[PDB]
Amino acid sequence: TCPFYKKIPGTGFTVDAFQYGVVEGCTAYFLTHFHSDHYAGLSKHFTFPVYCSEITGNLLKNKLHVQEQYIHPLPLDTECIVNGVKVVLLDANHCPGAVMILFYLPNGTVILHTGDFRADPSMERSLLADQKVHMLYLDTTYCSPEYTFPSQQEVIRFAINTAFEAVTLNPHALVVCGTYSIGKEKVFLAIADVLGSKVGMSQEKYKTLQCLNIPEINSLITTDMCSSLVHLLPMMQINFKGLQSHLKKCGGKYNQILAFRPTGWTHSNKFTRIADVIPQTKGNISIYGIPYSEHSSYLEMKRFVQWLKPQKIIPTVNVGTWKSRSTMEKYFREWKLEAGY
Template identity: 50%
Template sequence: MDDSSFISNELDENGFPSCLAEDDGEGGDSCEEVDGVGIVDGSDGKGESFAGSFYRSGTDCSSLLQKDPSLTDTRKSSGTRLVQADLFKMWGLKRAADSKAGASLINGTRGSDDRALQKNPKLRRVGEDIATSGNVAKRNCPFYKRIAGTPFTVDAFRYGKIEGCTGYFLSHFHHDHYGGLRKEWSHGPIYCTPITARLVKSCLAVDSIFICSLELDTEYTIEGIKVTMLEANHCPGAAMIYFRLLDGRCYLHTGDFRACRRMQSHPLLSSQHPSVLYLDTTYCDPKYRFPSREDVLHYTVEIAKSGLKKQPKTLIVVGAYSIGKENVYLAISEALSIQIYVNASRRRILQSYGWDELSKRLSSDGHETPLHVLPISMLSFERLKQYLDGYRQFASVLAFRPTGWTYSEKIGEQLDLIKPKSKGRITIYGVPYSEHSSYLELKEFVQFLQPEKIIPTVNVGNAATRDKMQKCFQDWMKS
């Protein structure tokens, strides 16, 4: 992949790549395409609400969809923008007038699919049935979100009440996983980690009676099935979910995760091969062999030190989603002994983690520290220049965009080959810091677990991609 093919050079206002290469998307989740989005406070229109600020911070980059070849020339030239589906309704916010906004995405295509489904209800996406009620197409929960032999689903809230399901698991608080949860939720208990539980309650106002907090590494018996939440090494509160059925079979659902060696020492994972592994396959392609997070963190810290040495009046900016990338700005803060400025909305989220090491480093005054955290969508030359104009004590901006989508095969693990983009007083580094497993990490994890069956949960909407992944699985199990 050469520099011209980076899908991460331009991100939309929610942190998604604005130009998506084919097969880079997750077919299992839907987003809306919205033009001219404007968010206003639901109360008096003065300033931005907590919900609005949370929305602007974006979501996890794993929920990407393919470009629609049927888009008009005008749309193609302006680029496709993916945003968090139904978040306006979820938060009760108003948006700028846009009668065309809100087209759902099914099978990687947009509004035209809804009309096609109404005309032909036999159309369906792989793994997902389409039921009809009158003239409205309704999607049924896909098989890879249901845990076979149990009354449970994982990250399937957007499908509403699911027949036969008496327990809904939430792996972590990213919108492509919690989408569909609203304050009116009443379909059954929501099982998740304590951090995720606090976020579900405070951010979505779901009634506490439906929120069931499960501690990590603690075995619970739920409807006769033993369940254990395991650290997923993804974002705060993210968990892999280990199910031990009555007949002795064990299933592991990874949610979104980044595989690492320490997982192999966990007694549950080392004691029995899982019958079924529901696997996060975001980067299940041999071209994704990005470096370890530790190496990327070290590189980022060294660049930040060098930047401040050359120009002491440098403002360091780290782009982040609403949840995730905390280790990047925490590493810079610790190495340089400086505080971290975040706005009130993000500060509220970070403090909900109960992560003292991070909380004690947070600042509410952007003028007193040179380290600021901004939504990843802010990392453009124009927006950073405007932001810098508000802090006259700084002479330049050194910004980091930490996401696996910045990875280049040409650079690989040679981080020193990364070339920043500069314009005027603004310099932006794209660093391949991912919170999903690389191809080699997936391979090692699967070879360690030796599951009887693997069900991919990402990039499943394309037959060629599914076949390619299955071939990878077969090769891994043979070697």
């Protein structure tokens, strides 16, 4: 049965709750973003109203084949009414089309659901600042002080300079970027832009990108691999074996590969700076691990919550074990004692 953390009290709404069949009492199903854990259970067979951003709606329509009659896309930063309740969608700074949802309940309680998010100080001057928020449903992916990472911009700068140097040193080198879902598109778009190239990719991946309302997209991406010096492949192929194999497929148009694996956090964030990063190398193939995160670091999450000052926090990630929940509760109390709410 549908957990309490996916239900919004005093409404018949749910959020990211598609895997439990028909939820008793639910009149509107919200979807924060197009990642499989969150959309799990949605298919052409779903027949209830789904509320989401325009980008998330395009994906639902085209990739999952959800019938158009059940898709209700809403604009961002706009007060809207859904089944008699005032809502607002905000940019979550996660992947394309990802939203936080602000619910203004009839009793006067205000609830923010973050979905998946990367907290940023620009969220402190949105519509969130206009009134008190009583309850917060929080993306707690990295809710522990060991989780630090560089800014997105530091990581992109490093990627840009690295790729530019390698291809100027060897103009027959190919750049590859690994991917598994939507998100982290700036990695491959910024590399291509500095190399004067389109990004080449499979038909399934191109169809995904064509849904994302990215301006001038037809000038940036192609299905013609041969014409392009940045290629996208599945994350699972980003290894010496997979990359040599792909290099054979391109017809000796390239004689070297430089590959990037954008990851989350891994244990080497605790010592290294982005400037110190060095690749793994076997022969004419180099692989760089780069920590490009679309979730809040501990410090970004703590700042956001200390600013927002919610009366209650409901975690939405790592809620499966008592140890995790207990640990998280501990950090929420510290934050509250330091900031005086």
